Curated annotation (Swiss-Prot), chain B:
It is found in: Cytoplasm; Nucleus. This is Ubiquitin-associated and SH3 domain-containing protein B. Interferes with CBL-mediated down-regulation and degradation of receptor-type tyrosine kinases. Promotes accumulation of activated target receptors, such as T-cell receptors and EGFR, on the cell surface. Exhibits tyrosine phosphatase activity toward several substrates including EGFR, FAK, SYK, and ZAP70. Down-regulates proteins that are dually modified by both protein tyrosine phosphorylation and ubiquitination. Disruption phenotype: Mice display strikingly elevated levels of tyrosine phosphorylated, ubiquitinated proteins following TCR stimulation. They are prothrombotic and have shorter bleeding times, which is attributed to insufficient SYK dephosphorylation in platelets. The active site is at residues 7-8, 193. It comes from Mus musculus (Mouse). Transmembrane segments: none annotated. Residues 1-261 are annotated as: Protein tyrosine phosphatase. Detected in splenic T-cells and B-cells, total spleen, skeletal muscle, heart, lung, kidney, thymus, brain and liver (at protein level). Highly expressed in brain. Detected in heart, spleen, lung, liver, kidney and testis. Homodimer. Interacts with JAK2 (in vitro). Interacts with CBL. Part of a complex containing CBL and activated EGFR. Interacts with ubiquitin and with mono-ubiquitinated proteins. Interacts with ZAP70 (ubiquitinated form). The chain holds residues 373 to 633 of 638 of the full protein.
Length: 256, 261
């Protein structure tokens, strides 16, 4: 009956900049944090830590943003039956932290859906990020479903894809998600990107999509852990926006 | 040995603005939070919620900033022997949350020192904030020492004091703190305001205070939980700024549009 879509939390490569790896990895490739907003450790990646550069983790405070949202869901008695995320490490980690907040991290298993990845035009670099595969994510103590069959496998995503291609895959993927969850629980959570909130829901509400210009402008409105909800109207496959089951989250920078 | 001075955590009245009380208290004075960065509850105050007007609490994120600082101190095996704070609720709550991170919120008792309050020129009106007295703080789940006799009681703070008066009293209170702790511990933590980092340590180190115009520019640069450290050279009474025993803490805002639709 309800679909919840939310943006990942605060990024290491935004707080500490594009050259963040320079401030936490030494010449031998040892992780040595230089700020309390950096995690105590980062999982070992199969391609080495240089894989972090196009696929950075959330910060300590990004983890907290996510946890507070999970706690809010719990306090509102909002049951989540199915949870999906983009393959980006920041989305997987946001989902895992929401599950911790919800006290469901030992029960729900996150379905990693490469079809939830953001518009690949925004991939900062020549090629797609070396996403940590679900088996390795589960090994890094992220509550991921290793058996989930993705609607768009990683190899079916195209670098620098068109806007129309991006929009199309969002709606199709969302519809496939809704369909497979249909008989098996009421509420679905998708943890993905700012673009996902617009792209996953636009045609779902029966609205016409916007040009890439209006789209990019709408995407800039979404805060970290920005959270929206839809409710299915009868059948139709038309969903209508609803007031979210939880309060919004707003904080400033450490500043100074 | 070491003197640590830090700024309080993120303020409710900064994030949610001057009129935050109007947002979260109804006409009957019931607190109803409207954002996940607002605490689940707030302490009852003697004069009702309007006492918050000039004395705002920290946010959920402010509590976490302070907790992480306390956790970091624990991880560096930095033992805090005495802890003082400004009588401002934001400073008291910050110090309490640091003690929680430090796992000392049952052992250390915070010494509320009105002498650590910021420059009184920054208080609007002709009256000081209605600070929660130490007895009522200890009662409101904040780990304060009700036995502590302040160096500068509330009554001894001047309304709209001059810059050099603020700088002098900061110097004087810090020396008095240092002196009373000498027999009993090695490390002192002061939890206060942006202005406190320089005001408490400048003359201690024999450095000249900046003019009040340069000072204010310097002050706005200090982040929430910004943390500095002075160390004493044996029994000389000579103090010098040192690298702090912990890492800095930096994060951004939620971003996007503050308000939609």
């Amino acid at each position: 009956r309800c679909l919840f879509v939310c943006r990942h939390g605060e990024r290491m490569d935004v707080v500490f900049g594009k050259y963040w790896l320079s401030q936490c990895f030494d010449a031998k490739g040892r992780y040595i944090r230089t700020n309390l907003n950096m995690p105590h450790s980062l999982p070992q990646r199969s391609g080495g830590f240089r894989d972090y550069e196009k696929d950075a983790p959330i910060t300590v405070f990004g983890c907290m943003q996510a946890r507070l949202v999970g706690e809010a869901l719990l306090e509102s008695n909002t049951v989540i039956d199915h949870v999906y995320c983009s393959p980006s490490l920041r989305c997987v980690q946001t989902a895992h932290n929401i599950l911790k907040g919800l006290q469901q991290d030992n029960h729900l298993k996150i379905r990693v859906e490469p079809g939830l990845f953001e518009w690949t035009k925004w991939v900062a670099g020549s090629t797609l990020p070396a996403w940590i595969p679900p088996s390795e994510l589960a090994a890094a103590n992220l509550s991921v479903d290793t058996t989930y069959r993705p609607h768009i496998p990683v190899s079916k995503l195209a670098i620098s894809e068109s806007y129309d291609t991006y929009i199309n895959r969002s709606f199709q993927v969302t519809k496939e998600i809704i369909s497979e969850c249909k008989s098996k629980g009421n509420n679905i959570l998708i943890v993905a990107h700012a673009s996902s909130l617009e792209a996953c829901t636009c045609q779902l509400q029966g609205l016409s999509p916007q040009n890439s210009k209006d789209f990019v402008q709408m995407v800039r409105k979404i805060p970290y852990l920005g959270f929206c909800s839809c409710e299915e109207l009868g059948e139709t496959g038309i969903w209508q926006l609803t007031d979210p089951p939880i309060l919004p989250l707003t904080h400033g920078p450490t500043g100074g």
